[PDB]
Every structure is written in structure tokens, then in C-alpha cells.
Symmetry: D2
Subunit: 300 residues, 4 copies
């Protein structure tokens, strides 16, 4: 059969897609209309969106379907899809509905890690004690101590291990520090923004959606109810993200440091590095004070 609208490759792709898809065009239409969640999936929508003929082509494909049987499977599909009101925006609202909960799930953790880390630090007394005996802390390893052949870090860690068995527990109170050092405050924000726009757009497309030109189209029906809930959820998320940014300020005072020059990621990435440096030093002392124990046995 010959093509009367679709262009070469475009038809080439639809032929494939729909083929390995295997599903009556009318069923696809009704699945899209009723938003059948027993059929629809993230990818399925991404594929329809990525394979759907341009609107201008759909208008051309429907402006002469009296010869339906005479159209290639690719263009027959085109005709059907030409019957769906507000196709593209409809598809995005649907895609959004399928993606939301999960893209929130992907964000929240970042926020919680940082939040927890900040909470952990402030409430960590052992780390406070460690500060006494003492951001610019990953430098102790780069100095010397009372005597020689032992970085200040070691002496600090040893002094801790001898009569401060407790300070040697601070790493076990800074659980989320590592997860926090992995976060990207920049990216964290971009996400909440893209999301902000995402919800806005879908709300618009809905508040601008037509009426029931077919008692099968139950779009505005659900979608309006969803956006509502997606909103309540986005707000709560933003509040969490604010509580984070906020709690990170409090540390900028208590531990006194500039929360404008040092990002949340960078900051913690160092506190984490130091926490390791400390654990490393402790292991090194245990080694030294283990071989030296022999160097004195070798005199016997």
C-alpha cells in the first residue's frame, strides 16, 4: 500500500512499533482515553509520545479516512489517533501521572540524607568532644605532634583512645554523613524546579481541557484529582527541602562557618573524609603500638 500523508521513515517506525506492539488501534485509543492503568506503563506512553505523527499530519490523515482499508497499518493508526482530542497534552498528563510518585521518591532521599546528617552532627556530643581536644580539620594529618614520627591526628586519636573511649564512637553517630556528601544541592534544586513546572503544565492542560465528546474519555475526571494530590505532595517536599537548607544554616552558626561559600555536598564530603582519616589513624596507632610491643619483646 502507498503512503498518502506520513513521510518515509516516520511510517517506517510506526510499522515497526505497532507491529511488535500487537494491539488493535481502537484498543489503543480507548486505553489512552480511559487511561487504563492495566495496560499503560511509563515506557508505553514514552513510546507513543516518541512515535506519534505530528499534529499537522494527523489532521491530514483524518481529512480523508473514507479509504481506511486502503491505508497502510501505519496510516490507519494515524487515522484513529486523529480521533483523540488534545492528544499530546493528554499523553503528557498521563505520563506525568505514571512518573510523579517515583520521581518524588528519587528526590526525597537526597533531602532526607542531608537533613539527617545535619541533625546527626548537631546532636552528636562525641563529635563535639572531639572538637574540644582539637571544616579545616582534614589538615591535622598534615602536621606534627608533641614528639615526632606521628601526625597530630594520631596523637589526637591516641589521646582519644586512651582516656576518651567515647569520642571513638562519633563516626557511629554520623550515619548519614556519607550519603550527604554524595548529594548535589544544585541538582536537588533543579529537580524541584522541573517538577514545579511539570505540575504547572499538566494543571494548565487540564484546566484548559474540553468536555466529554465521548462518554469514554475520563481524562479530566481523574487527572484533576491527581494533580491535586501531586500538589499536596510537592508542597510537603519543598517544605522538607526548605527545612534542609534551613538546618544547614544553623550548623553555619553553632560550628561557625560560611554556608554560602561551602555547599552542603562539599561541606559534608570533608567531614566524611575526616571521619575516615580518624578511623584510619586509629588503625595505624593500633599497628604501631603492636609492633613496638614486639620491639621491646625482642630485647628479651
Amino acid at each position: 500500500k502507498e503512503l498518502k500523508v506520513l513521510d518515509s521513515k516516520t511510517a517506517q517506525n510506526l510499522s515497526i512499533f505497532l507491529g511488535s506492539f500487537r494491539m488493535p488501534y481502537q484498543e489503543i485509543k480507548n486505553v489512552i482515553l480511559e487511561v487504563n492503568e492495566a495496560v499503560l506503563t511509563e515506557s508505553m506512553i514514552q513510546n507513543l509520545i516518541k512515535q506519534m505523527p505530528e499534529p499537522e499530519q494527523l489532521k491530514m490523515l483524518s481529512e480523508l479516512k473514507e479509504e481506511y482499508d486502503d491505508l497502510a497499518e501505519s496510516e490507519q493508526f494515524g487515522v484513529v489517533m486523529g480521533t483523540v482530542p488534545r492528544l499530546r497534552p493528554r499523553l503528557n498528563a498521563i505520563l506525568f501521572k505514571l512518573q510523579f510518585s517515583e520521581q518524588v521518591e528519587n528526590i526525597k532521599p537526597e533531602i532526607v540524607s542531608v537533613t539527617a546528617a545535619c541533625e546527626e552532627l548537631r546532636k552528636s556530643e562525641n563529635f563535639s568532644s572531639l572538637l574540644e581536644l582539637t571544616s579545616f580539620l582534614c589538615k591535622l594529618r598534615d602536621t606534627k605532634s608533641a614528639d615526632q614520627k606521628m601526625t597530630l591526628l594520631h596523637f589526637l586519636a591516641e589521646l582519644c583512645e586512651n582516656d576518651h573511649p567515647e569520642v571513638l564512637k562519633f563516626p557511629d553517630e554520623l550515619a548519614h554523613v556519607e550519603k550527604a556528601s554524595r548529594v548535589s544541592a544544585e541538582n536537588l534544586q533543579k529537580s524541584l524546579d522541573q517538577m514545579k513546572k511539570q505540575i504547572a503544565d499538566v494543571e494548565r492542560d487540564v484546566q484548559n481541557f474540553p468536555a466529554a465528546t465521548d462518554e469514554k474519555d475520563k481524562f479530566v475526571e481523574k487527572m484533576t484529582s491527581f494533580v491535586k494530590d501531586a500538589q499536596e505532595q510537592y508542597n510537603k517536599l519543598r517544605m522538607m527541602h526548605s527545612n534542609m537548607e534551613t538546618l544547614y544554616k544553623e550548623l553555619g552558626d553553632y560550628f561557625v562557618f560560611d554556608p554560602k561559600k561551602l555547599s552542603v555536598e562539599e561541606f559534608f564530603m570533608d567531614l566524611h573524609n575526616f571521619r575516615n582519616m580518624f578511623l584510619q589513624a586509629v588503625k595505624e596507632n593500633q599497628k604501631r603500638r603492636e609492633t613496638e610491643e614486639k620491639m621491646r619483646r625482642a630485647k628479651l
Copy 2:
């Protein structure tokens, strides 16, 4: 601080770690579960909820302690709140089912489509080309002089499929639906109007049912056509599995094509001999 009166040490430890990262008011989590709030629920969440959810007996014992709610630890408070959601488990398993269904159909369908296509692709020239250097090159040779042009995009896919697991999946799906359906039919009376469970589920189960039926039609069909193959190439549709049939048919299409490519390479290399000599 805060003694445990029901949860066992480890359950409490785990529930605590879990809640402390989920970060969400327990009552709100309850509502989310009740109304199957799809703007919050995800496959992971449900699975995690199911994995962490204290056992029924522990939830009960806790529900009989709502009294000192403020004295109970976080882990045990979540318990009290969850201990008020009727049919927690079958409910959670139904939601997990709704969240997973379309995905599993999407992952099962392609296996059937490939195999089906390979079957359709065959019936619709490669027949005469085997029954009749090596034998391949020989027959290939003839299909170049006397019967040329007598030289399947799914035959390859079909060879990687596994008929056995394909059946197990459909059978596994069948149970899943039947189980959800049963749980729904045996569900309590929704007092708290915030519980839109029986409604949603009864409807979804209907849809999954229609899709499963359609999916099973595609299956049986696939097998029907496979036997149509046991006719033309007269063989035991059970002695040789779909996987194998197309595996051979595949290793075949290759060797022949290679035999052809090899022939043509000698072919041209001869042209680059007739000219060079004159």
C-alpha cells in the same frame, strides 16, 4: 529511652531505620494506603512497607495499647496506627499487584509476539532450501545458477525465548489475579470513607482480567501456529521446543548466508583475475 512492649528487638530496629528515612506522619501513611494515593505509592514503597510491616499478631497486641501512644517508641507508634487498617496485608498485596500488573504484561507479551512473528514469517520461501566445499555452498551454488533469488526478523528473538518460563509466567499471573480477586470478595465493610479499596480494586481486577484473557489468547494462538509448523515440517511440537526449533532454524539461516557470502567473495575475486590477465 522508650521501652518496647510488643515489637521484638530487630523488628523495632528495622522499623525505626525505615521510618526515619521515609519521613512521613504515620496517620498520613495510613491514609495513603487507605485511598491508594497513587501520587505517593510506588512499587518500592509497597514492597518496603510489606517487608517492614510487623506481623499481624504484633499489630494486634499493639492496637490493644493505643492508650499510652505518647509513651511508645516511634517504631511502636507506627504499629498502633497501622494496626487500625483492616486487612493490612491482603490490601498491601493487592496494591502491589495493581502497581505491577501492566509492567508484567508488558514484559510477557514480547516473548509471545516474537515467537508468533517467527511462525508467521516462516509460512510466508525458505521451505525449499535444505531437504534437497560443503552441502550449504553446493545448494547455495545452485540457488545462484538455476533457482536464484530463493534466498525472519523474529527468528533470532524466538530463539532466545523459553516456552517453559513463558507458561509459568502466565500461570503465575493467573494465580495473582485470582488471589487478589478472592481477597477483594472476602474484604470487610469500608467504614472509614477514606478507604476507596474495594471499589478501585474490583474495577482494576476487572481490567487485569480482560488483559490477562487477551494475553492468554495470544499465547494459545502462538502455540497453535507452532503446531501448524509441526505439519509443514512434520515434527513433534513437543519433542522440540519452540526455543530449539527456531534455534536451529536460526543457526541455519546464518550458515547458509555465510556460505553465500563466502561464495560471492570467491565470485568477485575471479573477476579480479579475468581482467588482470587481459
Copy 3:
């Protein structure tokens, strides 16, 4: 330029290859002859083999040396390669030599995992104690139970203690056993640490292991063959016979060691078959260790489930508030 021998595609492919390769065709030839390992790599040899014009096609390009400069580069290369004796077996032997160490390194651990698992099983004082408690549990402390009086050392059977109720039906034999250990034989609980290679042994494939060895055996035999029949070197830069004769001996040495290690592995396994009464020729190594592994896992799960059950059972006691 214009092709005098090579088909069209071969000329194309070979060009892109020689191109993004940048190296005088003679230099390439010397690298192959000298088996220069400061240049040669596994990928490099594989490609030369994949892109090398057919043996016959190289023969033809031999009558075209006068017009070397007239020929297209793809064919110039063909002209050079055409000068190298036993080009393909040579190339295959070099690839073999470059891959040999990794190959041994990938077979050895399978053998070491199974072997160590067997030794660990023999030497585990706590697992041995556990077997005894198992006999005690099924032959004397649960007369009611399933096969009471017929328990032995079958490992897969131990995997079923989980599916059988003990005397009082408030516990499976597995849990009964676990509690017995926890209460009166704590040390036994440390048996898992005494079986470090068991999990790895469960993931092995005796069949593939055997295939790997036989393959290595043929690979080495083939190279030796090719070396035994190799033509006397004309060009001084041809180090093949020199390097490869030596290598083959070395590789044969390693393979024999592998074969013997594998043979020792099979011997220990036969011993396990008589001790845990199973047929080595019917219960693959991975099957046996998967059973031992799964048992170790469920036994540990059983212990946690007991502690849990014990803890909540105390909340029932303190319910008297």
C-alpha cells in the same frame, strides 16, 4: 587507486582498520614476527585476525610486488602480510599466549573454591558437632517426628528439617535444633565462619570447569602442533619458534598443575560422597554445596526467628501489668 584482488567490502573494512591504526605496514609485520609484547594486545591480535584478508586472497597479492606503490593501501597491507609464513596459526598462537594467564586465573578459583569447601567441611569442629546434635535431635529427641531414628549425615535432608514439626508442634525440627544449639551448645553457632568457601563452591559449574580444562588442553596441543610444524625462520626478526616453544612448555606446566588440582578436587569430592553418602557422579559439586549453603542460611534464619519468638514470648509475660 583500484583493487586487483580483494573483494569490495574487505578493502573498505581493512582501510578503516589500517587507518585508525596508524603504523607502517612493515612495522606491523615486525610486531607480529617479533611477538613484541610492548605493542601487541589481545584486542589488537583479535582485530588483525578478524580483518585479515583470506589466505588465498593473500596468495594472489603475492604476484603484485612490482606495482606495490600502484596498489591501494588496503592491498599494500595484504602484500606485506602475504610475506609472513603461517600467518593465521601464528596469529592464533600469539592470541593464545596473550590470553593464557587470564584463562588460568579464571579456572583456578573454581577449583580452589570447591577444594577449600571440602577441606573446610572436614575440619569444621562446630559443623561436625552440629551433625551430631542433628542425629541426637532426629533419632532421640523427637520420637513422634517423621523419620525418627533414621537421620544420618545427608545434607539435603538437613535442608528439610525446616519442613518437619518437632515433638511439641510449636517448632520445626530446624528451630528445635537451633534452640538446642543456642541453649546448650553455643560454640556450634559459630560453624558458619568455618565454612568460608561454601557459598563460592555452590556457584561453581563442574561441567563448565571440565570443559574449560579440556578446551585449554586442546588449545595448547594445537599450538604445540603448529610450533612443531613451523617453517625454519628466514627473517631474523621471526621470534615465533623461539618464544612459542618456550611458552608452550610453560603453559603445559600450568595446565598440568590445573589438571592435578582439579583431580585432587574430584578426589576430595568422592570422599565427601562416602561420608555424606551421595553419588559424586549424580550430585554435581554445585548441587551439594548449594544444599550445604542453603542449610547454613536457614539455620541462621532459624536462630533469629527463635530469638524473636523468645523475645515476644516475654512480652506476653510482662503483659501481666
Copy 4:
């Protein structure tokens, strides 16, 4: 059981786990290192020996316990044998270098070749030399009627009265690869390689003579070091020639080679190729559509005609 006499608790624990899985008799490990046995040694094997190896100070203290070898724990016996290998560390590092060399060269060459080939393809394509950053502004502002873009416009003009540009995009095979390369990293790779070769070379020169017929280190490394240098020199020849062809472009296209890095240059040049083909692709698209709309009316006309 078996009291440790030198090793620190951790090292011994780790050595034990390691030796538990490596399972190669200690003499055999030494023999293999001394023979530099290629049928046995692997990059991974050597990296693990290096990582597990007790520090020099411990190997020396164990080196003085040969008489009690049989009473020592497995990890310390291993230490004793290893302790008898002269220049163990430089030996192990040179061996690792010899195993890694040809491949780290193989991972550098490609980049140099991509950029090099790109520079060559460019200079040999007048098809581009002509087309004259701004190409962006055209794609920005719409044509007379919003119906099109000024880039499509220029693209169609070329496509009509200069159809010898449809090839341009296909004569820039390595430009994309070149856009991904990193000039700075390439340099480091080369300097890092030079240093590695120097250090090994140094160790071979200051290396103790063999006192047994099994130690093949000097014989092999001295020879290999010569081969690595030859290859490195050639690798550098290629590199500088790459920097030179690029320099040549700073003129043939007037632009400061110091300012704009190699990645920067071919990245823009990559996007350009993209933007153009884009327009051409798009033009051919809407022009194909117009064609079908024409045949649409024609048929829809012969229709109403044949009908009546």
C-alpha cells in the same frame, strides 16, 4: 595457635584470607616472580601481591627468622619467603608495568588518532571551508513567515544551487570523537607514561645482579624498557604531530589555538555539522510533505471528477 612474631594483627588476618584463596605454595610464588613467568603472572595477580605484601620493615624482621620457619604461622612463612626476594617492590612494580604497558598505549593512541584524523578531514573539505557562531542566530530568528527558520532558508539555497554540500557532513567521520577527547588528559597520560618508564628504567639500572639461574628480571626488564621507550617515543611523535595539525588549523581558519582547546574547537564544529544536517533533514521533510499534499488534492480532485 602459632604466635605472630612480626606482623600486626590486621596484616596477618588479611594475609591469611588472601593466602587462603590464592593457594599458591610460597616457593612457587617466589619462583614465578623471579622468572617473571608470563604463562602465570597477570596484572590482577601482581596488584594483589603488592597490596597484600607486608611493608619492608616487617619483611626484614621476618627475614631474620628463617631458622624457625616451620614454627611460624602461614602468613609469616609467606613473609619470610617473600622477604628473601631482592628489591621486591621495584621488582613487582616493574612487572606490573610490563604487563600493563601495551594496553595503556592502546588506550591513548585512539584519542590522538581521532583528533588527528579530524584535523585531516577538515583541512581536506572545501565543502566546509566555504560555509561562512552565526549559524546559531539563523536558527534563532524565524523566516519571513513563522512557517520557517533562516537556517532552513540558507540550507535549502545551498541544497539547490550548491548540492555539493550534502556530502560535507559525511566527510567529517572523526569530528564527534574529537569533540569528546580531552587535550589536557592526553598530555597527562603521556607524561605519566614517560615517568613510569623512567622509574622502571631507573630501577633496572640500580638493580642487583642475579645470584641464581632463575632470576630473569634484569634480562627481561632491560630489554622491555627499551621496547617501551621506542613505543612511547612513537606515541609522542604522533601526539606532537596532532598538536601541530591543530596549530595548522589555527591559521587555515584563523583562531588562537591556546585560547580554544581541542575539545572546544571540534565541539562547536560538531554542533555546526549537526545544526546544518538538522535543517536539511527538516527541509527535506516538509518538502516531502508538500509533495504529498499536492498529490492529495490531485487525487481528491480526479475523485470528484471521475465521480461526476
